[PDB]
Design an enzyme around this catalytic site. Structure first.
Site, PDB file in Angstrom:
ATOM      1  N   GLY A   8       0.855  -1.175   0.000  1.00 50.23           N
ATOM      2  CA  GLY A   8       0.000   0.000   0.000  1.00 50.23           C
ATOM      3  C   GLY A   8       0.896   1.230   0.000  1.00 50.23           C
ATOM      4  CB  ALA A  10      -2.014   5.496  -0.066  1.00 52.03           C
ATOM      5  N   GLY A  13       1.257   4.408   3.957  1.00 59.92           N
ATOM      6  CA  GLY A  13       2.154   3.271   3.760  1.00 59.92           C
ATOM      7  C   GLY A  13       3.505   3.756   3.261  1.00 59.92           C
ATOM      8  CB  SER A 126      -2.349   6.937  16.624  1.00 62.24           C
ATOM      9  OG  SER A 126      -2.748   8.292  16.836  1.00 62.24           O
ATOM     10  CE  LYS A 181      -5.959   5.185  15.629  1.00 62.64           C
ATOM     11  NZ  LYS A 181      -5.853   5.199  14.160  1.00 62.64           N
ATOM     12  CG  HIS A 184      -5.896   7.169  19.957  1.00 62.02           C
ATOM     13  ND1 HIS A 184      -4.871   7.881  20.553  1.00 62.02           N
ATOM     14  CD2 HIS A 184      -6.219   7.850  18.828  1.00 62.02           C
ATOM     15  CE1 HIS A 184      -4.590   8.949  19.824  1.00 62.02           C
ATOM     16  NE2 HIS A 184      -5.397   8.950  18.772  1.00 62.02           N
ATOM     17  CG  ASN A 185      -9.212   7.236  16.316  1.00 58.90           C
ATOM     18  OD1 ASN A 185      -8.026   7.519  16.637  1.00 58.90           O
ATOM     19  ND2 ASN A 185      -9.579   7.026  15.061  1.00 58.90           N
ATOM     20  CD  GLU A 188      -8.289  11.842  17.102  1.00 59.73           C
ATOM     21  OE1 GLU A 188      -7.272  11.119  17.133  1.00 59.73           O
ATOM     22  OE2 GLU A 188      -8.999  11.969  16.073  1.00 59.73           O
ATOM     23  CG  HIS A 449     -39.519  -5.349  35.033  1.00 55.83           C
ATOM     24  ND1 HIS A 449     -39.411  -6.345  34.078  1.00 55.83           N
ATOM     25  CD2 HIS A 449     -40.161  -4.316  34.429  1.00 55.83           C
ATOM     26  CE1 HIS A 449     -39.971  -5.934  32.951  1.00 55.83           C
ATOM     27  NE2 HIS A 449     -40.433  -4.709  33.139  1.00 55.83           N
TER      28      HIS A 449
END
Lengths: 466, 466
Positions: A8, A10, A13, A126, A181, A184-185, A188, A449
């Site tokens: 990859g 892009a 990568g 990240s 990950k 983390h986002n 963020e 209940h």
């Protein structure tokens, strides 16, 4: 042969491959199509990057057990990249998915590739484009034996904390890395929304200009709020376009998202975790997308006239305090969810180590992550970060500022969803008794209940009328 | 032959069958095992209930096209009940699932049964045990032709609004009914949490006794807050156990849940809807479950000493106002999600009709639902309930009370997650500009995510440093 290969070409990568190269490793590179691979080498003469234009050759050029880094965009392309590699792999080879992959997908591929003889490491990466090139936070999950084999390279390319520890560690089995990950986002999203409220409060209550905002954030950045997010924010407030207009003031207030924020909150709901702050962060992004609805509503709905907050410095300080305590609450909620997830998915997560690798490289990096590390260093099994001595003390000292800011905001028409969420959480968590007694009573009444009693063992049901 | 049959003789199915019987219909009854079926008839001599002890006979005793009502508990048993019925059905027969089924499951069964020649109606049934027996709100989704066939019976057994309209209507295709039932439940979670906050505020700020709580709720029930939930709440505060102890004060504050609350919020996150109030309601239930953590935290974390709210009557009124405006916000969010869901799943929901069938039978029944009906009656395409003249006016008049209550609560340590959510939503929605401009600026900075401008067409990206 090369020790590692990257698939990859892009930007992400390419940068990761260049990072690996900078550490003295020769890396094989490959990309579905050949133009990007040709551009990479064209643009990087003299670097130890060996291009391949067929999957087979790319796989053959790697020393075994093979370490293949997939940096293609998470989604179907991840599967096609894996499928194209398979036919050429030897049992024991390792595919590492660095995409922003949903953890259940990593769990599925890991289980499936394992059954065919291959190792699979789903890993969060990240740092943004610049971070991937210079030193990202890396969060790998998968077979431990595969992790140890590739670990030396991951450690060399990751950001390094100031205590010399590289920002990568073995997170856990199968999907643990991609789950961390995601969190983390989510965290963020929470930090950006808290900062966005700090900004609304300063601009709304003191009518600060952008230069004063920049100066304020710069000062906050010199203290305990010291963070990457605070740093770029002070930069943002000083940016002017080609004709002298402050860029921040003409950017359309429609906050986009790419799922991870949504994903964290959905997991909190599946795991029984009260992740209100990050969740409110996601919803605030959703409502900002209803821009046309908001402009329409602004001409119709009434609201109070926002009155000046008073002395500038004092208000600014209360907002700084509020923000910091807001982050404390958000992270307490985030790490409690990491525990709930660890339990659910059998990962035995090491919270202190996760906090340690968030100290640099990643987007949420900040001195604050060292406070969290210390908290786990002193008590690994601590039930909630709020109970940690350091955080307990900050709450003691800063809650009044949070309380004053929220009351001011609410009395003045300024929306503070996360600051409101933070105080509501702090006050609920420290409540030995909540009004859920009434909620339980109502449930037994209309739904039979049953309920439990505080003064008596047993499970009861009551004929509330007679 | 019988016009309709009921499968599942547990309480809910038994009651529904008795309801059908009370309207002059003879109904066939069946239950996996025969004891419950035998008890039903034993206990109900002279009623027109015909018991069957084999699936085949039960199916044969129904006039065609057959209308089979499954009242078994949602889950695997729904599938086994369906599977046991299949072999004996004629093309065109109708199975109606009245369980609290997740809508995607209904969509799956509907599509699958359709391919085999059978109609499938997933329908919400709300009213509690007593409601199912006397008149529940019924929310059917599935093939319209199947709905019309069974509709006459559903209309006779449903609760009837005071304008004479039965509380059942064709909701939409496939899973629309069960999706509306889920949302009713999410909305119910929101109302119970708002009421729980009203209670915490009165008890916390004015130290009201239970008798004063009962009296207050009784009065509120006489005005615009008039509702089933408010009614049982005043009852709850007057209930004493065998030794004179107020039951509400010794019920363990650990609010249980059964998914639907969770489900609504998860859908809001998939659909991009800012359903903060019901979502905070779910999280408040989650944190009340952390009872041991809360008692522990209460001995460790500090907080302010709650000071008296002041004049009793005035504070009580501000809390009443806050609650009512809180419900307005929660329902605005709920109906906006019903629209988002209608769009997503191609249901063309009729919001006014859904509001109409929530006027009686269901747990959230209240005069308030007539206000919503009126709002859609005057403007079917209204973008948000807050814009409706009636609601706009209440907001004009009651927001200051909401703002005062939240500030008081926050300054005094009383958690008000939903009241805080309500004001944050009202203030965000009416904001032509939110601080998401900064959020977008940060995203472009660290992630090159691009942004749009308010003063210029095009999509941009900026080199923020230089």
């Amino acid at each position: 042969k090369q020790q590692i290969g990257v698939v990859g070409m892009a930007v992400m990568g390419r940068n990761l491959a260049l990072n690996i190269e900078s550490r003295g490793y020769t890396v094989s590179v490959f990309n579905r199509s050949r133009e990007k691979t040709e551009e990479v080498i064209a643009e990087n003469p003299g670097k130890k990057l060996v291009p391949y234009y067929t999957v087979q050759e790319f796989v053959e050029s790697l020393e075994t057990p093979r370490r293949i880094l997939l940096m293609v965009k998470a989604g179907a392309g991840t599967d096609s990249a894996i499928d194209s590699l398979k036919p050429y792999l030897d049992k024991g080879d390792i595919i590492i998915d660095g995409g922003n992959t949903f953890f259940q997908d990593t769990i599925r591929r890991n289980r499936e590739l394992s059954a065919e003889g291959f190792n699979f490491i789903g890993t969060g990466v990240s740092g943004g484009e610049e971070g991937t090139l210079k030193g990202p936070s890396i969060m790998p999950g998968g077979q431990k034996e595969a992790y140890e084999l590739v670990a030396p390279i991951l450690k060399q390319i990751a950001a390094v904390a100031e205590d010399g520890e590289p920002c990568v560690t073995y997170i856990g089995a199968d999907g643990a890395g991609h789950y961390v990950k995601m969190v983390h986002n989510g965290i963020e999203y929470g930090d950006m929304q808290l900062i966005a409220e700090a900004y609304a409060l300063l601009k709304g209550g003191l009518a600060l200009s952008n230069e004063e905002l920049a100066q304020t954030f710069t000062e906050w950045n010199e203290g305990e709020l010291s963070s990457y997010l605070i740093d770029i924010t002070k930069d943002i407030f000083t940016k002017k376009d080609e004709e002298g207009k402050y860029l921040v003031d003409v950017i359309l207030d429609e906050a986009a998202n790419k799922g991870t924020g949504k994903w964290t909150s959905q997991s909190s709901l599946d795991l029984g975790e009260p992740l209100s702050l990050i969740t409110e962060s996601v919803f605030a992004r959703y409502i900002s997308s209803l821009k046309d609805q908001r402009v329409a509503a602004s001409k119709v709905l009434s609201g109070p006239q926002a009155q000046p907050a008073g002395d500038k410095a004092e208000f600014i300080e209360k907002v700084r305090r509020a923000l910091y305590l807001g982050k404390i609450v958000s992270y307490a909620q985030g790490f409690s969810q990491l525990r709930a997830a660890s339990d659910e998915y059998n990962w035995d997560l090491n919270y202190g180590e996760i906090a340690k690798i968030f100290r640099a490289g990643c987007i949420i990096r900040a001195q604050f992550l060292q406070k969290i590390t210390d908290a786990y260093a002193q008590n690994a099994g601590i039930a909630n970060l709020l109970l940690a001595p350091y955080f307990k003390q900050i709450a003691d000292d800063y809650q009044q500022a949070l309380r004053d800011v929220v009351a001011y905001a609410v009395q003045n028409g300024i929306p503070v969803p996360t600051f409101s969420a933070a105080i509501a959480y702090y006050d609920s968590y420290r409540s030995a008794v909540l009004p859920a007694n009434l909620i339980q009573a109502q449930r037994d009444y209309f739904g039979a209940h049953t309920y439990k009693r505080t003064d008596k063992e047993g499970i009861f049901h009551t004929e509330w009328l007679e």
